[PDB]
Every structure is written in C-alpha cells, then in structure tokens.
Design a protein around this nucleic acid. Structure first.
Ligand SMILES: [K+]
Ligand SMILES: [K+]
Ligand SMILES: [K+]
Ligand SMILES: [K+]
Ligand SMILES: [K+]
Ligand SMILES: [Mg+2]
Ligand SMILES: [Mg+2]
Ligand SMILES: [Mg+2]
Ligand SMILES: [Mg+2]
Ligand SMILES: [Mg+2]
Ligand SMILES: [Mg+2]
Ligand SMILES: [Mg+2]
Ligand SMILES: [Mg+2]
Ligand SMILES: [Mg+2]
Ligand SMILES: [Mg+2]
Ligand SMILES: [Mg+2]
Ligand SMILES: [Mg+2]
Ligand SMILES: [Mg+2]
Ligand SMILES: [Mg+2]
Ligand SMILES: [Mg+2]
Ligand SMILES: [Mg+2]
Ligand SMILES: [Mg+2]
Ligand SMILES: [Mg+2]
Ligand SMILES: [Mg+2]
Ligand SMILES: [Mg+2]
Ligand SMILES: [Mg+2]
Ligand SMILES: [Mg+2]
Ligand SMILES: [Mg+2]
Ligand SMILES: [Mg+2]
Ligand SMILES: [Mg+2]
Ligand SMILES: [Mg+2]
Ligand SMILES: [Mg+2]
Ligand SMILES: [Mg+2]
Ligand SMILES: [Mg+2]
Lengths: 197, 108, 47
RNA sequence: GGGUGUCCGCACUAAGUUCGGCAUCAAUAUGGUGACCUCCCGGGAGCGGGGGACCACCAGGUUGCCUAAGGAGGGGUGAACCGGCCCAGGUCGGAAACGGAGCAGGUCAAAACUCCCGUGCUGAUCAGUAGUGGGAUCGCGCCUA
C-alpha cells in the first residue's frame, strides 16, 4: 500500500553524509542499496555478456517494496548532480554533466509517478510521488534559470506538501513543513526574477 | 627573343596528376598523359611560335619516361608587349586549348 | 523436556553423547563436512 | 515455575568487507593542424602572393527527445617506408641567387596495444558483524516472590 517518501530520503541522507554535505558518499550508499535491493528481489538488469532493460511493470507493484528501487535511481542522479554543482565552481564544464543528470532524475520521478497512478497504491503515496516529481522538475527548471516553469513546479510542490501536512499530526507534519520552508527561498528568488520586467 | 618564352611542361595538363604534382587546370578539362610532342603539335597547328624541348623535364616528375618527358615553349608576346594572338592572352588559356584539342589527334 | 519423547531418553544408555550440544565441529564424531560443503559451494557459485 | 541465552546443512532484513566478467552516446559555433579539391593574381623556369568548398585529428565554448551509464580523465608503452618533419649525396629547373620533387641516414609518436581511476550493469565472497524470527531444550549461566 504505503510509502513515506520524504521521510525516507531525509533520514537516509541524514544518516549517510549530507549532514556534513557529502554528496559523493550518499550517491555511493544509494547505489549500494540499489544493488542490495536488486540482488535480494532477483530483479537483475544484466546477466553477464548481455544487458536487458529493467521495466518496473505494474504487477510486482504489489510488493510496496519495488518503488523504492526506482526512487533510488532518481535519488542517485539527483545526488550526482549536486556533487557536480560543487565541482563546477572550479571546473565549469562540469555544469553540463550536472544538467544531464537532473533531467534523468526528473525522468525517473515522472516514470515513478506513472507507477503510482496504479489502482494498487494508496492516496498518500500518490501525493508523496506527485510532490517529489514536482520538486525535481523544479530543481532542473531552476538550474536552467527558467523561472516561470520553476515557480510552477515549486508552487505545485508546495501546494501538495501542504495538503499532506494539513491531514495528519503536527508531530508528523513537522517534516512536511520543513520541506516547504526548505524550498521557500528559491520561490522568493523566482518571484524576483519574474517581477523584474 | 628566344629565352622569354612561357613554359608548358606535360604535368600541367595530366589529369592523372595532382596539384602538388604540378597540375594547373581542373581535372574535368585536363587529359590523360598528354605529351610534349602532342602539345607542340597542337600549338604549332593553331599558329603559335612554339618549339619542343624533348630534353627538358619537370622537376616534379619522378618518372623518367618518354610519356612524362618533355617541355613545350610558347612565345606569347613581341618585344613591344603586344599579343601574338588575341585568342591566347595568358598561360592558362594556352593550357586549356592544348587540353581541348589533344584528344582529337591520334586517340582514335 | 519434549525431547522427542523421553522414555528412550533413559532407555539407550541414559543421555545423548555427553559432548551432546556444543560446537558441531568440536564434538568427537569430529566430522568436518567436506563433500557437503563442496556441494554447497558449487551450488551457490554456479547460481 | 516461567522467560531467556548456551545448540543447528536453519530463515528473513539492514548496514558493511574482500574480489573477478562485460561496457564507456552524441549534435554543434569557433580556433589550430594535415591532406585533397577549386578559384583568382605575378613570373622566362623553379616558383612567388592571395581567395573560397570540403574531409579527418586536437583543442574545447554553447547544448540534449543519448543513455544501464558514457567524463572533454590518467599510467605504461608504443615507429613502418605504401606516415610527418630535417634531408649530406645525388637529380630536376636556373647564368646565377636559390628553389622543387626527395634517396641514404637520422629523426618525431598523436592513434592501437595495454593497465588503471571515474561511471554503469553484473557474478560471487566471508566456518561474518547487527536486528527480528524459527526449530531445539535433562546438561549451564542470567533475569523474575
Ligand atoms: K610521456
Ligand atoms: K623516414
Ligand atoms: K641537394
Ligand atoms: K614546404
Ligand atoms: K535450555
Ligand atoms: Mg533533501
Ligand atoms: Mg552532457
Ligand atoms: Mg541556460
Ligand atoms: Mg542439535
Ligand atoms: Mg547518439
Ligand atoms: Mg557529422
Ligand atoms: Mg540533436
Ligand atoms: Mg565534438
Ligand atoms: Mg575556443
Ligand atoms: Mg571567388
Ligand atoms: Mg602556385
Ligand atoms: Mg601557393
Ligand atoms: Mg587524459
Ligand atoms: Mg599503475
Ligand atoms: Mg599512419
Ligand atoms: Mg635530424
Ligand atoms: Mg646539389
Ligand atoms: Mg645542380
Ligand atoms: Mg642543372
Ligand atoms: Mg637541393
Ligand atoms: Mg626550404
Ligand atoms: Mg628516411
Ligand atoms: Mg583488467
Ligand atoms: Mg575523474
Ligand atoms: Mg536465535
Ligand atoms: Mg531460539
Ligand atoms: Mg529450522
Ligand atoms: Mg532443522
Ligand atoms: Mg519453546
């Protein structure tokens, strides 16, 4: 049924480095975790000497466990991108690699969002995924400085996470209120770039 | 006025030679292995003071063979600067004419 | 105390091997499981 | 008396360690370099001055409807003669000044080999650490009036 996405990412990132800012490590754990999930679930992309596309179809979605796999693809890209943003302050050609990754990060989330359109997944997870996709669409379309699309995705994101926050305990609401506070400055920056003309 | 005649070496027209090899005219118009003997025959035939130096060779010609041997000299102007024939005002034009006529002699 | 019954517990000579329970490689039967390991290695390896 | 550890060809999960196979996307604007092609101008030759089209390698500026990834990575090493350059002799053009195609000889390594780092997919590895379970329970500790 269920999946508390934002909580997963926040605790995982906090435990495995981003507390002291180590995007390279978190990418590493994110990769290792995908390896563990794949080896356990006997869901291998590639057998020696040949490669096959992993398609996360709708059936195995009953396991409420496979979505985490795709979520890990998306987190892996997103982390690598932020890593480059740090290395680009001194290598500017890195910026190009950065953008490529965010685009794939968004692509995974959109496919992930597509998976959560299934009638086998609960409403709360559908909102968490919609908010995640909106959020990455926002960070990509922010690094392209395309302010109107960025504010569209961030307002979609803020509205969704606010919908989730207003439904449960203030104790659990704290995390969601922290995400909206967490991206608010980008929102104000977007507005100041729109109202300049 | 013997020694101010312009020079024509076979290579300027040999379509199976390259520009680094000495060719001066487009490949479309040049002909295959034209010889100094053939060039002289056509230019004397059209009315030009020409003479064949059977014993001169182009520096750029490595092959020491009759078909590549030769230099043809053509008088283009009289001492006062006037043209021998208005029809051939420059070196290029002579080369082109040679290439045009050469195939009609004994190619058949 | 189930003991897979208990009459037999005293019937064949009162108790199991005195080494009994303890490390299985430590007991005096002293088997070290060669061809069974080998069969299980080769099994896991080959997939 | 109960609970629990001590026992096992046990099981699931999570964070780890060590190690092998395969794979390493492109579009461009511009600049340099080499070859061919094609235009002009000048000369009695050798040749001198200049203009475009296009191919392939390097750099590296903007980019992605290219991904399972695919960086403008590094190390060793690596030279024929149907590669580049320098070319005694010699040859060809020259009155000469000198210049051309260039032998012999020496000479220069971008690539391809190869080993990695990075990235992705693998296949394993440890008489395995932790957590929850299971079968098991005379022996042995520990926790419980
Ligand atoms: K070196
Ligand atoms: K050589
Ligand atoms: K010489
Ligand atoms: K030169
Ligand atoms: K016991
Ligand atoms: Mg975060
Ligand atoms: Mg890129
Ligand atoms: Mg931009
Ligand atoms: Mg036993
Ligand atoms: Mg492509
Ligand atoms: Mg192309
Ligand atoms: Mg394109
Ligand atoms: Mg390129
Ligand atoms: Mg540049
Ligand atoms: Mg023009
Ligand atoms: Mg010239
Ligand atoms: Mg020139
Ligand atoms: Mg390098
Ligand atoms: Mg080394
Ligand atoms: Mg070569
Ligand atoms: Mg030398
Ligand atoms: Mg000499
Ligand atoms: Mg000489
Ligand atoms: Mg001489
Ligand atoms: Mg010389
Ligand atoms: Mg020189
Ligand atoms: Mg040599
Ligand atoms: Mg190797
Ligand atoms: Mg690197
Ligand atoms: Mg146990
Ligand atoms: Mg037990
Ligand atoms: Mg069992
Ligand atoms: Mg059993
Ligand atoms: Mg029991």
């Amino acid at each position: 049924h269920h999946l508390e996405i934002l909580q997963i990412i926040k605790e995982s990132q906090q435990q495995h480095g981003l507390r002291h800012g180590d995007f390279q490590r978190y990418r590493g754990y994110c990769s290792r975790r995908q390896r563990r999930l794949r080896k356990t679930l006997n869901f291998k992309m590639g057998n020696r000497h040949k490669f096959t596309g992993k398609k996360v179809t709708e059936d195995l979605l009953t396991d409420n466990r496979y979505l985490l796999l795709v979520l890990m693809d998306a987190e892996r890209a997103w982390s690598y991108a932020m890593q480059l943003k740090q290395e680009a302050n001194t290598e500017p050609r890195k910026r190009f690699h950065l953008l490529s990754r965010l685009r794939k990060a968004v692509k995974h989330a959109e496919e992930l969002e597509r998976l959560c359109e299934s009638n086998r997944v609960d409403a709360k997870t559908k909102l968490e995924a919609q908010a995640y996709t909106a959020y990455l669409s926002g960070m990509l379309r922010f690094e392209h400085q395309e302010w109107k699309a960025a504010i569209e995705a961030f307002n979609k994101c803020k509205t969704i996470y606010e919908k989730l926050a207003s439904a449960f305990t203030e104790e659990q609401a704290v995390l969601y209120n922290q995400r909206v506070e967490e991206i608010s400055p980008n929102i104000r920056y977007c507005a100041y770039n729109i109202g300049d003309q | 006025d013997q020694d101010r005649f312009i020079c024509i070496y076979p290579a300027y027209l040999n379509n199976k030679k390259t520009i680094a090899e000495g060719r001066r005219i487009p490949i479309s118009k040049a002909v295959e292995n034209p010889t100094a003997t053939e060039i002289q025959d056509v230019c004397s035939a059209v009315g030009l003071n020409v003479f064949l130096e059977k014993n001169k060779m182009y520096s750029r010609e490595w092959n020491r063979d009759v078909q590549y041997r030769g230099r043809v000299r053509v008088q283009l102007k009289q001492e006062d600067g006037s043209l021998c024939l208005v029809q051939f005002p420059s070196r290029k034009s002579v080369m082109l004419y040679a290439a045009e006529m050469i195939p009609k002699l004994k190619t058949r | 105390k189930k003991k897979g019954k208990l009459p037999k517990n005293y019937d064949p000579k009162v108790t199991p091997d005195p080494e009994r329970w303890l490390p299985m490689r430590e007991r005096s039967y002293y088997r070290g499981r060669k061809k069974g390991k080998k069969k299980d290695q080769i099994g896991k390896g080959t997939q």
